Design a protein around this ligand. Sequence first.
Ligand SMILES: [Cl-]
Ligand SMILES: [Cl-]
Ligand SMILES: [Mg+2]
Ligand SMILES: [Mg+2]
Ligand SMILES: [Mg+2]
Ligand SMILES: [Mg+2]
Ligand SMILES: [Mg+2]
Ligand SMILES: [Mg+2]
Ligand SMILES: [Mg+2]
Ligand SMILES: [Mg+2]
Ligand code: NA
Ligand code: NA
Ligand code: NA
Ligand code: NA
Ligand code: NA
Ligand code: NA
Ligand SMILES: [Sr+2]
Ligand SMILES: [Sr+2]
Ligand SMILES: [Sr+2]
Ligand SMILES: [Sr+2]
Ligand SMILES: [Sr+2]
Ligand SMILES: [Sr+2]
Ligand SMILES: [Sr+2]
Ligand SMILES: [Sr+2]
Lengths: 186, 160, 95, 154, 140
Amino acid sequence: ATGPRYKVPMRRRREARTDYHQRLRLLKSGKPRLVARKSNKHVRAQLVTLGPNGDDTLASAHSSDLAEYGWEAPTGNMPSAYLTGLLAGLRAQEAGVEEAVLDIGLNSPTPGSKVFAIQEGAIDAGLDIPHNDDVLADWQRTRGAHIAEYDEQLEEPLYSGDFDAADLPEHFDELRETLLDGDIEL
Amino acid sequence: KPASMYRDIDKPAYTRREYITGIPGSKIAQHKMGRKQKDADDYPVQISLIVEETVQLRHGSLEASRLSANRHLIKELGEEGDYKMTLRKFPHQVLRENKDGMRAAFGKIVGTAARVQAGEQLFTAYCNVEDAEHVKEAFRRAYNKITPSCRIKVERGEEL
Amino acid sequence: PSSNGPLEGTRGKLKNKPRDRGTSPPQRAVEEFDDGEKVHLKIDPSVPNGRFHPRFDGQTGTVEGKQGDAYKVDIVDGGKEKTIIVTAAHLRRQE
Amino acid sequence: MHALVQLRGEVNMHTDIQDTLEMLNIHHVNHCTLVPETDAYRGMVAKVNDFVAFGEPSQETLETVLATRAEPLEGDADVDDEWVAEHTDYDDISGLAFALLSEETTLREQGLSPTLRLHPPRGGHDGVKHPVKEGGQLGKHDTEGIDDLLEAMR
Amino acid sequence: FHEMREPRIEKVVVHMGIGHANAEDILGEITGQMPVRTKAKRTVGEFDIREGDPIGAKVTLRDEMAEEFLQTALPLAELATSQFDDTGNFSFGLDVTVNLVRPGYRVAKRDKASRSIPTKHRLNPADAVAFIESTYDVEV
RNA sequence: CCUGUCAAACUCCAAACUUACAGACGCUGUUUGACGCGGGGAUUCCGGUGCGCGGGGU
RNA sequence: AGUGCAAGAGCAAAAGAUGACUUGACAGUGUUCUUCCCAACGAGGAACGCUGACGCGAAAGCGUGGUCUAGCGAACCAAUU
RNA sequence: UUAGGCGGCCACAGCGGUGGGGUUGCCUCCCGUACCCAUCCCGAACACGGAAGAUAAGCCCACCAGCGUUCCAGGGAGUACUGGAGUGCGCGAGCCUCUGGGAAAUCCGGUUCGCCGCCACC
Ligand SMILES: [Cl-]
Ligand SMILES: [Cl-]
Ligand SMILES: [Mg+2]
Ligand SMILES: [Mg+2]
Ligand SMILES: [Mg+2]
Ligand SMILES: [Mg+2]
Ligand SMILES: [Mg+2]
Ligand SMILES: [Mg+2]
Ligand SMILES: [Mg+2]
Ligand SMILES: [Mg+2]
Ligand code: NA
Ligand code: NA
Ligand code: NA
Ligand code: NA
Ligand code: NA
Ligand code: NA
Ligand SMILES: [Sr+2]
Ligand SMILES: [Sr+2]
Ligand SMILES: [Sr+2]
Ligand SMILES: [Sr+2]
Ligand SMILES: [Sr+2]
Ligand SMILES: [Sr+2]
Ligand SMILES: [Sr+2]
Ligand SMILES: [Sr+2]
């Protein structure tokens, strides 16, 4: 910009997307990165391996294509986050992927978060990812007990779209049951 | 000291003052002579003094050939004549002299010189048409105080 | 010279041009080479660890196995054989 | 196909240029070799420029040279049409001379020594100090210019 | 277009810098939150040589606790024209500084894919004066 | 803006050239065995000069 | 800018600063390069491994000292385990 | 890719600026703190829960070259410098002929306002 002396950063550092310093440490393991990226409305879960011209995705999972199985509930929450992770690891079991690491990128390592719910979900799918069981959320915040004890504090409804009144975190249980089944169209 | 010791270019480029200390200042006073308020383009004539041989002229030889050269233009055209003379070279090359024996041979700092390649203009004057034969004479005196044989070249002037 | 250290007279080879400054890309730093493969030896000024002796910059060796994550490269220094321990960051695939 | 002929001695000439000359089958002064025009062979004759004399010969001249100066790979014998006919892959001297010029086969391939050992110039050469352009004898000659030398060196 | 362009109060910063402690009490009284100490850099000869030492005290007010403070803070100072920044900010004073801004300043203060706010969407000095003039006081 | 010059310990530039490896051409080796390896015996560690590049010195 | 100190070199969601935690400046044993271009030579040094015990982090991972190149010493003898 | 995720190359991608684009779609700004987590003070951020509105941001899409960067033409220039040879010139520093290479500056004219990979997706 100022002259030939000026150093313009790397593209995905300029864009403030990829953190190369932390990303390097992830690649040092050899195992594929379980890319866990959040969104306001949805949540994504990718399985990425390192390639010649760029990163190869072997198994993705968006919370949009979760509705395709039996979901009418919102897509950017804790019950959804586990199930997006569970789907991802299940697809990956069929791709030959035995083990993987967790990449959160620019997402913060906060105890009991959506990324740590995606990580928990993928491990439960049969994958071997390095974790720490106590940093993960307890079976209940993963189920959706915290959202139910917020809909109990009513006066005015939580959800706008015609789904239900007091909210059903049982839909979590109803999905994990049919995802552990081998018949399911992945 | 005889210029025969420093006239040739054989020593490396020794100009960095952040490494060389105790350097004697320039003997030269004015690099821009005449009427320095007027432009060089306001003049029909541009006669320069061209150096034929690749030399290394000292600040003393520069001051001396600038002095008796400009002093002819102050004599013939007056103290405020219609001219402007210029010395486009600057003394950067720092000189040495070993002054014991050959033990600790790196000499102490004595003076400064300017590296002039062959074909270059040491001096360049810009005058009027009638004052031209006075400047070709200010340069005939100026080449006698420097080391090489010289060409007096007219760069602008088909008025003959 | 004035000194006999490793980084003697290495201003030019161990310094990048202003545009190639900053942190280096992880793609080459995690590159996997096989045994028998040909490599080019060039030290990356951004990367400090996993280097070799500056006297070997510009060598074209042959990989003969690895030591952890770093590579063991076989060169011929004049006439004497040498087995250089170098990380991928400081290697480049030949041809 | 050019005709390289060594005109300057081995003394005082570089080891890397003396080895190139030897790689081009030339070891003594006045010794000649028939060299193809490749990229590899182009850079060899250039490094040897100042100690040699070269150019493409005429079908006429090469024939006169081969007759008087060519020898077998091993042997003292004359190389005439009858010799050529029985060892080589050609009918007469001309079919060898043509194939050599068109760059199809070499002297080695035909059982002949890669060296045409010539006699010192009759009338003397033009000078081992200056090139062809300055009226000397070193470097790339004219087709007619090289013929004068090889024929003077019968 | 006007709704996603009309400004609002982001952070009201109140600061009291002494250099030699007592100023923490009167801010916990007028605002409505816990205050924080301010340290400094570089050695100064006016008995301010120490680096890691409590010199000042400040507070940042977000949302409701910002507007409720300004209802009593603005009818005190005589607002001028040459008291404004190029980005559309003012400071009056005890120091009180308000950071007014457009409905999309999360883009510059977030983590994931940050970007700076363009010169075409940045708050204008004059457009900032017009916003405050519209809520209980005068300009000039 | 206009205008005048520099850099062995400066660099947005930048050769010629030098250099690692590989292919090919040449050359060399497979009874003159190269390349390599092991062993025995040395002499030698006052150098000089021409050309090219130098650093010091009138 | 800073990064202890010469100079050259490295460095920015860091190798810099602040905060908290921590003591890997840990034990043992090697490959390699260097010291000594090529090309034999000690001490010292550096990169890189492995076995053991720790520190930190969610995790990859990083830590065999302070970002790299100076701060070092054979035998005998003296003390110590 | 009618707005997504991960990247490789790491300014041909910078800087600056014009224009256009979103009913249950995507991405956002945006709304809100019971919880998980959070600020040495602030739900600003960080984390979490959610859609009243929104295309003005960002981002995605079309375009401008004024600055910076890449490459190409022609001009400078086969000039500066140079590998090899010379009983070629100069008192000398130095120059020159022949052979093989070959710049940088700057000027005008063009190019460049990113290319490609894996995945997901009316
Ligand atoms: Cl994300
Ligand atoms: Cl090494
Ligand atoms: Mg150098
Ligand atoms: Mg014979
Ligand atoms: Mg005769
Ligand atoms: Mg003669
Ligand atoms: Mg003793
Ligand atoms: Mg003791
Ligand atoms: Mg628009
Ligand atoms: Mg002479
Ligand atoms: Na003495
Ligand atoms: Na770099
Ligand atoms: Na404090
Ligand atoms: Na000797
Ligand atoms: Na040692
Ligand atoms: Na917009
Ligand atoms: Sr000299
Ligand atoms: Sr003279
Ligand atoms: Sr050299
Ligand atoms: Sr270190
Ligand atoms: Sr809010
Ligand atoms: Sr003489
Ligand atoms: Sr003389
Ligand atoms: Sr050419």
